[PDB]
Scaffold this active site. Structure first.
Site, PDB file in Angstrom:
ATOM      1  N   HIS A  22       0.615  -1.105  -0.063  1.00 38.92           N
ATOM      2  CA  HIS A  22       0.139  -0.051  -0.135  1.00 38.92           C
ATOM      3  C   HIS A  22       0.937   1.349   0.121  1.00 38.92           C
ATOM      4  O   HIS A  22       0.292   2.308  -0.297  1.00 38.92           O
ATOM      5  CB  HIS A  22      -1.237  -0.136   0.845  1.00 38.92           C
ATOM      6  CG  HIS A  22      -2.370  -0.061   0.136  1.00 38.92           C
ATOM      7  ND1 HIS A  22      -2.531   0.131  -1.208  1.00 38.92           N
ATOM      8  CD2 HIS A  22      -3.773   0.785   0.534  1.00 38.92           C
ATOM      9  CE1 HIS A  22      -3.928   0.498  -1.663  1.00 38.92           C
ATOM     10  NE2 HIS A  22      -4.526   0.900  -0.364  1.00 38.92           N
ATOM     11  N   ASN A  70      -7.808   6.338   4.122  1.00 39.35           N
ATOM     12  CA  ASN A  70      -8.949   6.548   3.705  1.00 39.35           C
ATOM     13  C   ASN A  70      -9.446   8.212   4.045  1.00 39.35           C
ATOM     14  O   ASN A  70     -10.300   8.786   3.680  1.00 39.35           O
ATOM     15  CB  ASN A  70     -10.245   5.736   4.598  1.00 39.35           C
ATOM     16  CG  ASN A  70      -9.574   4.452   5.129  1.00 39.35           C
ATOM     17  OD1 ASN A  70      -9.747   3.463   4.627  1.00 39.35           O
ATOM     18  ND2 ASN A  70      -8.575   4.580   6.040  1.00 39.35           N
ATOM     19  N   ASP A  95      -0.100   2.629  -5.626  1.00 43.34           N
ATOM     20  CA  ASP A  95       0.215   1.380  -6.201  1.00 43.34           C
ATOM     21  C   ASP A  95      -1.176   0.820  -6.956  1.00 43.34           C
ATOM     22  O   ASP A  95      -2.288   0.940  -6.462  1.00 43.34           O
ATOM     23  CB  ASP A  95       0.403   0.457  -5.321  1.00 43.34           C
ATOM     24  CG  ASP A  95      -0.223   0.504  -3.899  1.00 43.34           C
ATOM     25  OD1 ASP A  95       0.248   1.610  -3.286  1.00 43.34           O
ATOM     26  OD2 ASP A  95      -1.082  -0.091  -3.698  1.00 43.34           O
ATOM     27  N   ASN A 116      -8.474   2.611  -0.829  1.00 43.18           N
ATOM     28  CA  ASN A 116      -9.131   3.565  -0.019  1.00 43.18           C
ATOM     29  C   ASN A 116      -8.836   4.934  -0.193  1.00 43.18           C
ATOM     30  O   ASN A 116      -9.414   5.828   0.187  1.00 43.18           O
ATOM     31  CB  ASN A 116      -8.946   2.951   1.447  1.00 43.18           C
ATOM     32  CG  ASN A 116      -7.673   2.255   1.548  1.00 43.18           C
ATOM     33  OD1 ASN A 116      -6.967   1.640   0.560  1.00 43.18           O
ATOM     34  ND2 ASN A 116      -7.021   2.178   2.664  1.00 43.18           N
TER      35      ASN A 116
END
Length: 184
Positions: A22, A70, A95, A116
């Site tokens: 992430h 988020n 990514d 997110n």
């Protein structure tokens, strides 16, 4: 075009999340800044941090959100409209889940999902038409939840190549910047 660009490295805060999939957005932003001789300094106003550089004559501000995914767009909304950056002069490096490991692409606009964070940036900018540098990470293996697949560090073999992917994706970025979609 006496205009600045906002390069944005998406990633999560902490040492656990530093080598997870992430966060390749955070990593590629760290090499862009070192490369260009730039430094990250708490950017109190938006709450995120910042580095100023220049690449090809075009000046650029690189941001790495000091809050988690988020919520990423809550710092990049205020961060741009204060930097006078147009939503389409922003480059989010993230990514890509629906790209194959070692794959990099440039797309502006062009919906994008499983992240997110880019929903968080689209929900802050109003539009989804920003420029994106995409770093393919692959699909989970079988039963792996997509969202939990991403919060796991690459595997010993994938990460022999990581350092050199975050190198071609610093090139990819650097090259959009000087031409644009003419570069792909």
């Amino acid at each position: 075009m006496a205009e600045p660009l906002l390069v944005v490295g998406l990633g999560n805060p902490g040492a656990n999340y530093a080598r997870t999939r992430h966060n390749l957005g955070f990593v590629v932003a760290d090499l862009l800044a070192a490369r260009l001789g730039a430094k990250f300094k708490a950017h109190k106003r938006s709450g995120a941090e910042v580095a100023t550089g220049r690449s090809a004559g075009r000046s650029l501000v690189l941001a790495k959100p000091r809050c988690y995914m988020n919520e990423s767009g809550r710092q990049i909304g205020p961060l741009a409209k204060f930097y006078s950056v147009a939503p389409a002069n922003i480059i989010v490096i993230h990514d890509d889940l629906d790209l194959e490991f070692g794959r990099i692409r440039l797309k502006i606009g062009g919906g994008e999902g499983g992240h997110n964070g880019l929903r968080s940036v689209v929900a802050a900018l109003g539009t989804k038409d920003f420029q994106r540098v995409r770093i393919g990470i692959g699909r989970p293996p079988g039963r792996k939840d997509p969202a939990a697949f991403v919060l796991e560090n690459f595997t010993p073999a994938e990460r022999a190549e990581v350092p050199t992917i975050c190198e071609q994706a610093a090139d990819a970025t650097e090259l959009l910047i000087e031409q644009g979609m003419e570069p792909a």
